[PDB]
Amino acid sequence: STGSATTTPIDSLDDAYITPVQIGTPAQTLNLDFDTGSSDLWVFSSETTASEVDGQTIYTPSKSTTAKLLSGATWSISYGDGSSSSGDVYTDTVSVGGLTVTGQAVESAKKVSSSFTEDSTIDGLLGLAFSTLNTVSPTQQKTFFDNAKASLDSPVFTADLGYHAPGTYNFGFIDTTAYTGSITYTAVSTKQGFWEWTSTGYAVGSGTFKSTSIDGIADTGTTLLYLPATVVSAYWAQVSGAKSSSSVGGYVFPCSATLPSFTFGVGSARIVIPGDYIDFGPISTGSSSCFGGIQSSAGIGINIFGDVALKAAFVVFNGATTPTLGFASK
């Protein structure tokens, strides 16, 4: 089997991407944030504290003839950005782009943090990291991909995120029309539960490539590109007037600037992030100070190849017995 679904930016900045997901019988379609940095499929629901729901579409398990309470199971997750959610668990039928999993754990939120409430466009998350990170207790549950894998034509999914435009998540096949040149594959460590790999270096604009190993994670659920302070300083030094602002929470730059591109290495291959992908717009409405899309990972504890990087590539998440990651230009 295969599946193919369009993923759409939630706003004009590509702050996140939503993908429609069918849950239950009859189907209830929710728009979920596919997140290769976590491993829980959780939804706003009829069980979510009413004051914490503000415009989201909810899953109502009592209206699904295939929903079953997973007795005694609870979940609770905290994300890198400080947000969180928790609740109980159902199993139900879940379909993405025509690919169906029966008995998928659907984690129903009883509580969500303010950041989730305040984002009316995201109805929940669909985790695509390794199932070892799943938070369900006392019996850990598998991700949608893990459940689908054996049925797929090939044990892979691909992320093809758009810049200010829709893109695609495919399951079970590689669309050879969706990228240019070849896909370069690179090793993955699953030791921390992530799609963790090592970039071979970087360049800023038309500058020379610096060969240096940068360990980080391919994370569709993180907006920005978080890299070591040395790398980030070298980037922003090429933008007149750019500075790190402790009050704002990162590098800012004059909105009148033209940003240089940023290149990262995948083996001997190179992925170029155009400068415009690095512009996250005014820090507050009407400001002429703009927020940068490349930020320091210092104090995160890990480098994160988030959407800013991934949307410059066609990315293969290869879930073979020994997982790997593939990157192509597009």
CA triplet 97, 102, 103: central angle to 5 degrees?
130
Catalytic, out of 45, 199, 261, 296: 199
Tell me if the bond preceding 61 is cis, omega within 30° of 0: no
Please report which helix (H) or strand (E) contains residue 145, including its range.
helix 144-148
Encoded amino acid at 252, one letter: V
The experimental technique used to determine this model is: X-ray
- Strands, E assignment, 188-302: 196-204, 210-218, 225-227, 243-245, 250-254, 262-266, 269-273, 279-282, 289-292, 294-296
On the 0-12 / 13-18 / 19+ scale of CB atoms within 10 A, 74 is middle
Q: Which residues fall within 8 angstroms of residue 103, CB to CB, at 6 or more apart?
A: 91, 92, 93, 147
Q: Which residues contact 261 (CB under 8 A, 6 or more apart)?
A: 204, 205, 272, 273, 274, 275
Q: Which two tokens stand for residue 304?
A: 């994160």
Task: Tell me whether residue 35 is one of the annotated catalytic residues.
Answer: yes
- Hey, which residues does 269 pair with through a beta bridge? 266
Phi-psi region of 37 (alpha: psi -120 to 50; beta: other; left: phi over 0): alpha
Domains annotated for the chain, with CATH where assigned, are: 5-174 (2.40.70.10), 175-330 (2.40.70.10)
**Phi, psi for 118 (deg, rounded to 5):** -75, -10
* CA distances for 286 relative to 247, 281, 317, angstroms: 18, 10, 39
Measured CA to CA, the distance from residue 192 to residue 215 in angstroms comes to: 12
| Distance separating alpha carbons of residues 193 and 202, to the nearest angstrom | 25
Helices (H) and strands (E) in the chain, counts: 4, 24
- Are 14 and 164 contacting, i.e. CB atoms less than 8 angstroms apart? yes
Resolution of this structure in Å: 1.1
Annotated catalytic residue: which of 35, 88, 160, 307?
35
